[PDB]
Coordinates of all heavy atoms in Angstrom, one line a residue:
Chain A
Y81 N 81.3 80.6 82.8 CA 81.5 79.2 83.2 C 80.8 78.2 82.3 O 81.1 77.0 82.3 CB 81.1 79.1 84.7 CG 81.6 77.8 85.3 CD1 82.9 77.7 85.8 CD2 80.8 76.6 85.3 CE1 83.4 76.5 86.4 CE2 81.3 75.4 85.9 CZ 82.6 75.4 86.5 OH 83.0 74.5 87.3
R82 N 79.8 78.8 81.5 CA 79.2 78.0 80.4 C 79.9 78.1 79.0 O 79.3 78.0 77.9 CB 77.7 78.7 80.4 CG 77.1 78.8 81.8 CD 76.8 77.5 82.6 NE 76.6 78.0 83.9 CZ 76.9 77.3 85.0 NH1 77.2 76.0 85.1 NH2 76.8 78.0 86.2
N83 N 81.1 78.6 79.0 CA 82.0 78.5 77.8 C 81.8 79.6 76.8 O 81.5 79.5 75.6 CB 82.3 77.1 77.1 CG 82.9 76.0 78.1 OD1 82.4 75.0 78.5 ND2 84.2 76.4 78.4
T84 N 81.6 80.9 77.4 CA 81.3 82.1 76.6 C 82.2 83.2 77.0 O 82.3 83.6 78.1 CB 79.8 82.6 76.8 OG1 78.9 81.5 76.6 CG2 79.3 83.8 75.9
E85 N 82.9 83.8 75.9 CA 83.9 84.8 76.0 C 83.2 86.2 75.7 O 82.8 86.6 74.6 CB 84.9 84.5 74.9 CG 85.8 83.4 75.3 CD 86.8 83.0 74.3 OE1 86.5 82.8 73.1 OE2 88.1 82.8 74.7
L86 N 83.0 87.0 76.7 CA 82.2 88.3 76.6 C 83.0 89.7 76.6 O 83.7 90.0 77.5 CB 81.1 88.6 77.7 CG 80.0 87.5 77.7 CD1 79.2 87.6 79.0 CD2 79.3 87.5 76.5
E87 N 82.9 90.4 75.5 CA 83.7 91.6 75.3 C 82.8 92.8 75.9 O 81.7 93.1 75.5 CB 84.0 92.1 73.8 CG 84.6 91.0 73.0 CD 85.0 91.4 71.5 OE1 86.0 92.1 71.4 OE2 84.4 90.8 70.6
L88 N 83.2 93.5 77.0 CA 82.5 94.6 77.7 C 82.9 95.9 77.1 O 82.3 96.9 77.4 CB 82.8 94.5 79.1 CG 82.4 93.2 79.7 CD1 83.0 93.0 81.1 CD2 80.9 92.9 79.7
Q89 N 83.9 95.8 76.2 CA 84.6 97.0 75.7 C 85.3 97.8 76.7 O 86.2 97.3 77.4 CB 83.6 97.8 74.7 CG 83.2 97.1 73.4 CD 82.6 98.1 72.5 OE1 83.2 98.6 71.5 NE2 81.4 98.6 72.7
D90 N 85.0 99.1 76.9 CA 85.8 99.9 77.9 C 85.6 99.6 79.4 O 84.4 99.3 79.8 CB 85.7 101.4 77.7 CG 86.1 101.8 76.3 OD1 87.3 101.8 76.0 OD2 85.3 102.2 75.5
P91 N 86.6 99.6 80.3 CA 86.5 99.3 81.6 C 85.5 99.9 82.5 O 85.3 99.4 83.7 CB 87.9 99.3 82.2 CG 88.7 98.8 81.1 CD 88.0 99.5 79.9
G92 N 84.9 101.1 82.1 CA 83.7 101.7 82.7 C 82.4 100.8 82.6 O 81.4 101.1 83.4
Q93 N 82.3 99.8 81.8 CA 81.1 99.1 81.6 C 81.1 97.8 82.6 O 80.1 97.1 82.7 CB 80.9 98.6 80.2 CG 81.1 99.8 79.2 CD 80.3 101.0 79.5 OE1 80.8 102.1 79.6 NE2 78.9 100.8 79.6
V94 N 82.2 97.6 83.3 CA 82.4 96.5 84.1 C 81.5 96.3 85.3 O 81.0 95.1 85.4 CB 84.0 96.3 84.3 CG1 84.3 94.9 85.1 CG2 84.7 96.3 82.9
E95 N 81.2 97.3 86.1 CA 80.3 97.2 87.3 C 78.9 96.7 87.0 O 78.4 95.9 87.7 CB 80.4 98.5 88.1 CG 80.2 99.7 87.4 CD 80.2 101.1 88.1 OE1 80.5 101.1 89.3 OE2 80.0 102.1 87.4
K96 N 78.3 97.2 86.0 CA 77.0 96.8 85.5 C 76.9 95.3 85.2 O 76.0 94.6 85.7 CB 76.6 97.6 84.3 CG 76.5 99.1 84.5 CD 75.7 99.6 85.7 CE 75.9 101.1 86.2 NZ 75.6 102.1 85.2
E97 N 77.8 94.7 84.4 CA 77.9 93.3 84.1 C 78.2 92.3 85.2 O 77.6 91.2 85.3 CB 78.7 93.1 82.8 CG 77.8 93.4 81.6 CD 76.9 92.3 81.0 OE1 77.4 91.2 80.7 OE2 75.7 92.6 80.8
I98 N 79.2 92.5 86.0 CA 79.6 91.6 87.1 C 78.6 91.3 88.1 O 78.5 90.2 88.7 CB 81.0 92.0 87.7 CG1 80.8 93.5 88.2 CG2 82.0 91.8 86.6 CD1 82.2 94.0 88.5
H99 N 77.7 92.3 88.5 CA 76.7 92.3 89.5 C 75.6 91.3 89.0 O 75.1 90.5 89.8 CB 76.1 93.7 89.5 CG 75.1 94.1 90.6 ND1 75.5 93.7 91.9 CD2 74.1 94.9 90.7 CE1 74.7 94.4 92.7 NE2 73.8 95.1 92.0

Side-chain angles (χ1 to χ4, degrees):
Chain A
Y81 197 81
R82 311 297 163 211
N83 297 112
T84 309
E85 285 183 307
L86 296 166
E87 307 182 75
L88 298 164
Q89 292 197 105
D90 307 282
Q93 311 309 126
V94 185
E95 54 177 6
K96 302 307 162 63
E97 285 275 307
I98 59 193
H99 191 42

